[PDB]
Symmetry: C6
Subunit: 202 residues, 6 copies
Amino acid sequence: PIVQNQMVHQCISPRTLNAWVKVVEEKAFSPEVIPMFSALSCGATPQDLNTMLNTVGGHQAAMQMLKETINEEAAEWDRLHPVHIAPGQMREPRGSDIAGTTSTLQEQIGWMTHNPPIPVGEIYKRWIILGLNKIVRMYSPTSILDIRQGPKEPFRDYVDRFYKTLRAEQTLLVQNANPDCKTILKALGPGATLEEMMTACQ
Amino acid sequence: PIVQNQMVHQCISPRTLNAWVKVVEEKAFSPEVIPMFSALSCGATPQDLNTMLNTVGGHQAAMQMLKETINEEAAEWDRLHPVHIAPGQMREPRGSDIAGTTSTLQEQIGWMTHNPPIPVGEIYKRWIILGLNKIVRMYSPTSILDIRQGPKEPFRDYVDRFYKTLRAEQTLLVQNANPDCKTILKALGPGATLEEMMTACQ
Amino acid sequence: PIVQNQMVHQCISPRTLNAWVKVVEEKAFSPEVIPMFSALSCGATPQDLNTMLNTVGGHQAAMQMLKETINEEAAEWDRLHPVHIAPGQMREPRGSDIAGTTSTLQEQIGWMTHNPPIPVGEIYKRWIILGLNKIVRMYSPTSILDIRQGPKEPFRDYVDRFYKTLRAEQTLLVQNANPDCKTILKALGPGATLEEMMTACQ
Amino acid sequence: PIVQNQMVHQCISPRTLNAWVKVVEEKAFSPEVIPMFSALSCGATPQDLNTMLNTVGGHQAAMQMLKETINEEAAEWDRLHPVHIAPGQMREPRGSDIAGTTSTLQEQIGWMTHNPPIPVGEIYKRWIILGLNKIVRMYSPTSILDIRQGPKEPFRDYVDRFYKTLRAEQTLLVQNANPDCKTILKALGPGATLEEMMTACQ
Amino acid sequence: PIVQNQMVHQCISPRTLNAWVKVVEEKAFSPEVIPMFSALSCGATPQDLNTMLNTVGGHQAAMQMLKETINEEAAEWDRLHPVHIAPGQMREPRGSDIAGTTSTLQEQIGWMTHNPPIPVGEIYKRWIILGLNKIVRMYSPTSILDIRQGPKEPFRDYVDRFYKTLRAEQTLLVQNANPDCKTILKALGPGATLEEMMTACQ
Amino acid sequence: PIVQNQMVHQCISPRTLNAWVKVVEEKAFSPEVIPMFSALSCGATPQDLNTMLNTVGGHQAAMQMLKETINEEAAEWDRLHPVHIAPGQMREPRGSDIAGTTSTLQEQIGWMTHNPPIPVGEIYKRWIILGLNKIVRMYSPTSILDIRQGPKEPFRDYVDRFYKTLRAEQTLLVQNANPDCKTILKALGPGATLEEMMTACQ
Ligand SMILES: Nc1ncnc2c1ncn2[C@H]1C[C@H](O)[C@@H](COP(=O)(O)OP(=O)(O)OP(=O)(O)O)O1
């Protein structure tokens, strides 16, 4: 990554490398993996971002879909930012330079520490997160329409499943509740908070 | 977080990220989780606070209730602190800026390191802890009225359950004691310390 | 804590937070927990000391007894050190300020880094350790009078139990020994060291 | 490694040493091991690279093949860069000096921190990765021709196996699909993205 | 401990605290525990040394014997170095000051960082190691006279037991060997190295 | 160890101490332990090297053989470098000073940080590694002559055993192969690389 000592390059740590590998192994593409990726890739160069992605052993269907999203975003960058070099001067980054495939670590450091900075690490992380959100959505197992409260299921456990599913996918909470809780929630009226609904069906 | 090197931004560590995720997995919303959250979020930016909250996989009913509390506190901030920009100058933070949803990391750093400082991280942590305390209270399984000493239960074990329940929820200690210990505690008289009561029923 | 970089504030580490939580989980209030608490709270502010105490999930009977001891010591501080402010000047700490309940982190830093320093962290740790020693003594399961050597118990194992019990509670070593070892220890005479007694009954 | 404090030598950490040993033990020569090697050897001297390779206990067939690749690349370096010393001056590195077998740590530091730098660590890592890719390819168990979707296998699981195999080895995705999914994928037409194909056979 | 930043005090780390506690739990008073103690207490103040000793939960017979040795060495220090204060000046350390029982942390820092330094940490560690060696010797289970090679025991395994026992306790190697190996070792003659003896009976 | 802050002494870390102890416990004297020792002892003083060796609990036959090698190398040093002191000046190191038995830590620091430096840590590590290689060779269980490919053993698994044994001990690869693979390898002709031989018998 690039961090303050002045902004300088540091090697990606074994702790960071191990943390990302283990979260993907344990959680796959559950929605909470994306905030973890963003946090573990704080200050990351494009090289560091590729390192994190390439160290993942499984899920190569997802990793191939991520490449497609990256190539789509890279092509859109080139359309908006065409490139035209002067000896010892900074070249303009194309899409593949931002993605780390045609740029060196020194060029990436040169862009990220410039004044004003050309934040190639943050631009590329945005493309990666965009691709990761699409993977989270596709690998979401259930529709919100099929999350309904069981006859003896606690309302809290049902609401956990409801908003877990909604997070992966992205009135109905009351409609999908069981007969006993639904009748209570209808009686509360409009403008009921989640807290009040959960207290009522407790 | 923001820490002294002069006050500068540092990346949230894998250790901090992992610690928060594991305590929530192991303890859910037991009352002791809130002091752990506050300690792990020492010097945290609003971005860091969102990172910690968003990395939690389960408990999405609770996380949705937390958003409602955050929105309520954000709306109250806007009522008390209305916003009105001058090129290259610091804008006034609204509720959603304090919550990290409409503010950038650089703006958050700008507020937190200003002289005098506008501590958006500490203001937002206060809102989060307020919301977390409400969740702790709702998820408390038992009323203090139902914590009574068993016939053969040690007084120490009963007092542990009593103040555990009282912590989650928030004369009666003697009333809820068993016949044998109650008679001893009545004989001690007024002004008895917990130490003296526990020694007496040992 | 407060440490040398000049004396500056540092965030309590996840390692320290985790270490204290796990020792209490594994050892409860065995006497060796108190030296571990003191070491883990090296340079601790009153806020840090409260953090460590409040992160403990179980043992709320003990934690309530600790509050009583803290309030007793705080009341004794106020009797000896009554408080009387001048703009931008340091106020005098009362008992509740030393205990971290009515003081801010900045005030605690202000006292601890003053010249001369008002060491509120060390004063409060003294009160906490005083309260923790009382808890260790009450939770000690056995009297030293009931620690006697078994017919086939090795003398070393008996001496381990003897001084383990004595540590928790706080001639008799010979009296509580078994017939065979007692006869040997009587024959050694006065002024026998523990080493010599243990070698004799080996 | 060599890192910024000015560029200075640091000892390879126990964490780095342990991380490399464990990944090889757990993953053998799965393709994702090579990006992990490159990341863990960030800033590595030739001595550090040899340390990492020599600490591997098993897989001595692979380690011997790696030596052959290293010797081939070293011989090609000597053909392109023949060596010709002046007291207290920097000598030109031959292939075996880049590989760390005939050079000292001080000479390696001298080359890597020169202005302009002769990056012997990065040149040698390139040779090692070249040799490691050949080992990954040989130890790949299955041809892409033999990765075909099962009658009841989910398309996602089949695509995972397909691109896992393709990564180790390096129209057909549709041909190797099962009758039901193949018919759907043919109906999509040309220019179908992986996302669209995976959604169609879901 | 006291370390270079100029020599300054640092808090004993949770890693050091945990390491010492676990080695004592796992190894008891096997001889290799003493070099581990010395290494973990590198730069330690008398307070740090007491912390390490006091954090040990079991083995209170041994810890009491250690106190006796410490008191003996402290009494011998007072005989050789009698003490006689001038405002704001450094007092002379007595035995109990070196042992950390009657000295403060600031006085210990004052002695250890003086020019010339009065190394109270190293003097006390010497006394502790002296006491720990006596405990290792007493808790050694077997005499070297009873370490004899079995009929089918490999010579290497026998030599391991022989020098393990000799280390705990502190021609005979040949005498205690089995008939077959003894005859071979007699035939080698005088001046045989351990390597040669072990190769011969392999 | 001695490291750059200027070259200064640092305490050996608990991580380094633990790493060396565990590798010896897990791997004994497999050849890969020697590169791990060298890496973990980077910048080590003679005191640090003794610490690492003395913290090993088992294998006292091997540790005694290591002392013999150390004494042999120390005696050879004294023959080549005889010693002859001037107040406040650096004395010449004898063999036992390099081995850390008759030298203090300050003298070791004095030699290692001199200009020009007398690298007593690196000289002693060389002697230790020499002794460790002899132990690896003696504890090697099998001769390379007895490593032959099984009737149904994969060639890769056989080559792994072959070069594993060769590493511990230090045309035949083809001779020791099974009838089917041997016939294939003979047909390849002279100048066949290991890669080509392994591909042929796959
Ligand atoms: N082979 C394995 N099987 C099961 N669990 C494992 C394995 N390897 C590692 N783990 C898990 C269990 C342990 O709790 C944890 C070990 O990491 P740990 O030593 O606690 O980190 P650490 O505290 O040394 O890191 P730091 O360097 O930050 O102190 O990882």
